Every structure is written in C-alpha cells, then in structure tokens.
Amino acid sequence: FRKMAFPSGKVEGCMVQVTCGTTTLNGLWLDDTVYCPRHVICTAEDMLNPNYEDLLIRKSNHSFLVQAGNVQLRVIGHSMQNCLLRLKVDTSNPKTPKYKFVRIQPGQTFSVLACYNGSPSGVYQCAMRPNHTIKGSFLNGSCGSVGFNIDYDCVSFCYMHHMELPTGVHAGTDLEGKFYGPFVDRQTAQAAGTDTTITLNVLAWLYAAVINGDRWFLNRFTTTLNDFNLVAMKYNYEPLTQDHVDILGPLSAQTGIAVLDMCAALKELLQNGMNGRTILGSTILEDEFTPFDVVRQCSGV
C-alpha cells in the first residue's frame, strides 16, 4: 500500500525559472502572473534581517529574468503579497490548468513537485506535520517548488517552499505568501517545535488495513474518547477530537467499525506492539495517509 503522488503534468506546465541578480529559483506561472518566494531579491547578507519592502523599491521589472524553457517571459509589473512576489508578465500561460489556492490544515497531505531552476526533478507525497513543517527532500535551488492536491480537473495549490530548518525539515507558505507555523523568511534562531503522531491518519490507515483484509489487530471492546487520549498522549499521539471522529465517518460506515472501537484496537496496538506481525506490510503504524487518501487509493479514483 504505497504512498502515491498525484499525476504531476498539470503542475509541470506551470513551472518557470526566476532569476534576480545572482539568485535563481522556481516560479509558478498561472495566467499572466508568476509567483515565487520574495527572498529571490536577496543575496545572503540581506537574509539576516532584510527589509524586503525597501529592498524591492530599488528593483525594476527588468531586474527580474523569468524563464520558461528557453523562451524568456517579459515582466511588466511586480508587487509583494506577504512573503510572496507577484510578477505580472506580458504573456498568459497556455498550459494554465483549472486551479484554486487553499490553506492546508495540520496533518493533511499533498503532492510536491521538486524543481531546480525551472526544471521539475521528481514528485513525491508528504504530510503537513503537526509542528507545521514538512519532511521532504529539497536540495539547492528548489525554492518555489509547490505542493498540491487534485480533484477531477482542478488543481489545488496549498504549499510553496521557502526555508529549510536546522532540523533538516522544511518551512513554507500557501499561495498567498503566509507561512505555515511561526517561521519567518529571514536568517534567525527559529527551530521546529516538537512533533507528534497524526492520530487521525493512523486511524485512517487501519481502516485501510481492514478494508484490504488485514484485521488481526481488531478486538471485542471499545473505549471512551477521553480514555483513548490518555493512552495515546503517552505514546506521543495527537489528541483525537470529536471533529476528527466525524471525519472518519465514511470509512467507519464502509467497514461498520465505530471510530471508538478502532481506537480501542489502536490503544492495544500501542500498549502491546505488533508482536512481529505486520499491517499492510509495514511493521510500524503509518500516519501520512489521510481519510481521503484511503478513499482515493482504495475506491480507485
């Protein structure tokens, strides 16, 4: 039961290379606009505490060299939106797909197209960690890479890559330039807060297991939401909430297994381990599959 990424075609046709001075990074070209991290107008030393607003005032449209393939895209305007830079271009992207901009919620997942100076290198699936960071894979020049989800024909952009944390983790923003978590796009102390296990997804994963015929971990009992959190929180699990239980409704309806019955099973899985057994292969409890991903991959969309 692999972690699948959405096909990346619609997004590949939107990646461009943005170069301001000696700095280069990726850009998203939708219609007559290109979005890219604002720190593109920097050269290290500024980073310490650059006053972007004032560092942009000295910039002009010709200060920016946007490139799609070999062709050069003439920039006819520039503004700043929070941590992003909106560059207007004299040309509307003929490959612009139907899209939306949405702010993802902690624990939810998406696909990430890693890019290096305009060129899509690879694609992979990840989850927005509770601590508001993502455990991805970004080398040099991958800033501006984006995360997205697909629903039919509509591409929902939710993440744009900006910083890397000393933890080896990653910080970013939504397509409105606002960061996920406390992080700032400067060079400071800032570190990732401690992370927890996404209880909701682990639960979704178990339902998946039961759906494919892997159900040894099930039991005859149940539990109270309060009793489950007491156990779960010991094992460093996110507290489960009523709002979460309701998200599990469909899978629960599909399997006829009440969320709290499954919790009862999870509580036991946590206090006794798996005893060498396995679930859907893994020897550990997977927490990067949302209830939706389960519905997606199983009900073959």
């Binding site: 990074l25 920097c42 080398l139 800033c143 890559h161 910083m163 990653h170 796009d185």
Partner: peptide, 5 residues
C-alpha cells in the same frame, strides 16, 4: 536555516 533552497 537555509533560504535559497
């Protein structure tokens, strides 16, 4: 905290 990445 790398920022160019």
């Amino acid at each position: 905290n790398s920022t160019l990445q």
